[PDB]
């Protein structure tokens, strides 16, 4: 099995719900990020063998948005492209899965990552084809139905976070403390210029979007503590300690280690291992724990071997449980902030956090890193990298 | 790289648009087929490592229908599941891609295939979230937008068939002759009992659906010749010489050859090779040609080495071009009929035609077989098998 | 104040919900009836001074359907036309109100009546203009919201019928007995040809609709008694003892008595008096009682002076209460059946029952007659006529 | 025939489209105005015999908004209420029609006027009941379809204004001059306090709305001249020289002159005459001319006998034609501005302009006045009053 490297990465800024990218499609965001990821690898689009891209809320976008992104980025029509959906994990598992194909020898160079525009996701009318007949009918927000709710238990992803808060005894204050830290880390990182390298500007014909919109500077514990529960009466999970609804894309080039050598490409990192695992849908936020254990075992590593972690902040409640049960270094995870501050553009997020990880590892001169996400429906996915 | 076998296959009957499965969801169809594919492999659901399933028109179905099918079939919550979209090719590339993962050693046993309910696909309101403001607004059939039209050229898949009819000089009569033969082959096969083994009944709480609904017995050239063009004024492509709109699921168990040996499983076939390739979106129906050339080259085979072909009949116009340019045996392809007669439930079809191939190879005592499909957006995918 | 006569009347057959007029608009039905009412008066359309027409469920029909009907019937553009909405009473109060204008001297000849197509009434999206923002939204059947429910108490008109059943002690069996009689009277009248004169055929380009569709021959008490309550758990009101949902139009020509004399027109009847009155919305079905008392007082009559009654059968429960409290002759009311059998096309019904009254009075050689309807929102309206 | 007086009048401020009353329903606006009109007549709600109210865009508002307004204003359930639709004329013809009923002796005291909330008018789905079946479907703005377009010619009311501009040779500059004057007159009147008396505040639970929102102070000819045509390529009619889309209600109490005497009510004015007339739909904006000629003839008056005119400014193009052909005093019409500045809440406007007329007549000590409006579908309606 040959080794695989991550040659390059680029992401758009993450937009707020109804914000910067209210009218800039997932495909357009993806093309912007893909073109730049290709340039950052010192290759041309014709050198991509195939594309494998995450995207969840794809209703009304036309056939196969991965193909749309690939062709829009200038990749020839001869190269295949496919969209994948493992919900919140899609943008990261595209990377690991592509690495599987390349390790096997069936591709040398792939475009991977994910794209998501939650603002532009549509409403649905299930009765429209054959009729409602009589009486009021369903008129469904596809974002909630297909993206932000659990189908097995018919409740919001936020209720799965409440389930973890209750079972792991994670208090409101503990959740708010994590949220506060996320905001302040993101504020500080943004102001120090630490997102400048990874971001590619989006040009709207002109308006230039090059800053993460969702970060809330001057968040305080006093403000967070006043918020009402968002999902459950007398709950603990609030808008302030939950991830945002957001728009963005993030793209990477992966290739065989031997191909990077041939081409004289200095990669961001080498892929060490990966893992995807399941848990009960009711506690989906715990998914990163078995996924990460699997990935570490495959690498012959323990958490003590990992220098830097990106663990997606779907909800503070789940994030606290994951950090505690994996024995992660509490200030060596999401060191430039997480999704509570930066946002959670579902099918992009796994690629977004990997991009942030890789650029931070390089600037710190870290050796090893880990990206992991929880996944609606009860899964986790993880990627371990080294440089 | 280890060898991979197809342990088992099962499909539902294919329903007509608004017909047998008007109210039986893609997930319910998938669960029915998956449970039976698992039983036909002499394994239990806990023995599945992960599931990889095709599905295209998934709006309003909730998170990740592959996970829904897996859990509904009794596969434990610990096993991952992911949905893929390479349009019309999804149900076949799930099989080849799973084989890649198993060859590499990262899975031993997987549930693969696809599920699609076109009848139940919803209408969309793009302006619903932020408002239409003033004046009439878009109200979009997701089936047409996301399934049956080309996004690059903004026209129906049927126009891509007209493009091939014009460029390859495939006449109306030639298209109707293929359609006629498809109908009569399907009629004859159904009446002789040749679909009995592969089909699993769907039980609606009771009504039992166990017959392919869409076949039109007593089709004639006179009837076909009277039909009006469906897509283009003065065109050649009609409802009669085009695939149907349809509902169905088809599921298979794939596993390492060594695992089948261990378990004493007699497989339907061994996977020989695969290929996925691109063409211009305008001529998407030609995709099977480069895909199949790639697969044959990988196998060190020529078309002369292949005993039986399933080539999905998206449109007679494209099907004639594919058969002619691959030098396929004209009566050794779709020998029990094709999608003009049986239907084209988009994300299921690749798994549907593979199921029909495998059961026919076994009954004929054929040695080698090939399944291939054209793919909206300009692709093809192929799988070569041997027994 | 001068006297006013009803010169002529014509109605379409009443169609079933989703039936004969599923695709024949309220305006088209109205034009058919209006043209024939004009001919039955021995006048030309230019002789109409103005039109006043009922119609309730007018969403999406374009500006002012009375004007559409008038112009479609050939009435000159110079003649005004206006639509009125007093819900179920609209088609009758158009007649009385026109008579007020003519009595005063401000019109000599008017087109009156009503038109309604419940099948074609649309669904509504209240959030569409400014957006739903997030989460599922309302998708409203305008027929139920604007036609068949009480806005003050937010429940179906059928619940107002339950309120009367409870307060007046009208049993399920008593309701079913009235329904049975309605069906059998309608069956018998239709078969004997008694609707032949009043109906004008509707020609659909050809299909001719000339029979009341909704009548259920061979209704029996056994069948009625098996029906489930339609509106309230453990209720008394069922689909069988409630009015139908229906489509139809009915049009009349009214004119000053002196104008009919001048023109040598033999009128169907002379208007004696009218009345419109209110009750609590909760008991709207009782409206005919105060309305009729008012009309009788204005005429210096008692119910004993009335030879024939049409009292619209919105619900058997309310109809029994009205007949009992007005001391109506139980077999001198709705003698050819009522709306349980024939249907209730809301804005047409008042004109429909008046048309049936006038033709039956003439054939019986009756002298006096009365039409009355209950009205959603808590009203009744009545017209007394003589010949 | 007895004489009829206008005892009192009250109107809400007129809101901008999506503005002050974006969420304050037509019924709520109507109730506010009705309660105050009743108080301004020195009567109690139980003294109202019946209500007759205009309203056009009533989809989804529930049964019969006149009844809703009446009951909400405290009028007893015994008193009838009916909604009328003669499009733009509805709020004025309610007044004249009520006067007909009172002159005849069938009512002594009525609540009249109109209410309209264009912002809150819904979108419609004609195919929703029985289904769209396949392919995109209609999704219709009820405001445009039922309020702001001509059904006979299937084009916007603004095109009827272009038709008049062309046929009467009314230039862009002439239209803009009228618009400019409307804005400046309204600005000046508002600033001088001249709307203070007629307006009743709307209290939103608190926010108080008591100023006409739509007036554009500092409008200039330079600004107006830069606007693009709104309805026709190379047209003359723009957003600046057309009426607005707006929300509001206006209510009046009318009663027999002898009843006002009995009660010691000093009326705003006595009704002299009225008229409603038709023209071709294509030139609907001309309707006021025959309507006004009819009203003047009935009064034995000429335009020279009229001291003050309110002629609704649907479009400057039509307004210029009406003023010129009626020989109106150019600065004795809309002396406090018109609908270009103040707005055109369709079913309210006739009552709105009458309210403004009556209060201005009183403050000027004028003797005679005239209100007139053009009406979509090709009509006009007029009321002449004296004090």
From Swiss-Prot, chains A, B, C, D:
Top-level EC class: transferase
| Top-level lineage group | Bacteria
* Primary location recorded for the protein, binned into one broad class: cytoplasm
Recorded GO CC terms: cytoplasm
Question: Could you tell me which CDD domains the record lists for this protein?
Answer: thiolase
User: What keywords are assigned to this protein?
Assistant: Acyltransferase, Cytoplasm, Transferase
* Recorded catalytic activity of this chain's protein: 2 acetyl-CoA = acetoacetyl-CoA + CoA
Q: Does the keyword 4Fe-4S apply?
A: no
Q: Where is the active site?
A: 88 (acyl-thioester intermediate), 344 (proton acceptor), 374 (proton acceptor)
Q: Give an example GO molecular function.
A: acetyl-CoA C-acetyltransferase activity
Which Enzyme Commission number(s) are on file for it?
2.3.1.9
Q: InterPro entries under this entry?
A: Thiolase (IPR002155), Thiolase-like (IPR016039), Thiolase_acyl_enz_int_AS (IPR020615), Thiolase_C (IPR020617), Thiolase_CS (IPR020613), Thiolase_N (IPR020616)
Q: Pfam families from the entry?
A: Thiolase_C (PF02803), Thiolase_N (PF00108)
Q: Where found in the cell?
A: Cytoplasm
Q: In its keyword annotation, does this UniProt entry include Protease?
A: no
- Provide the assembly information: Homotetramer.
Instruction: Cite the PANTHER family for this sequence.
Output: ACETYL-COA ACETYLTRANSFERASE, CYTOSOLIC, ACETYL-COA C-ACYLTRANSFERASE
Q: Which family does it belong to?
A: Belongs to the thiolase-like superfamily. Thiolase family.
Tell me which NCBIfam families the record gives.
AcCoA-C-Actrans
What's this chain's function? Answer: Catalyzes the condensation of two molecules of acetyl-CoA to produce acetoacetyl-CoA.
Q: What is this protein called?
A: Acetyl-CoA acetyltransferase
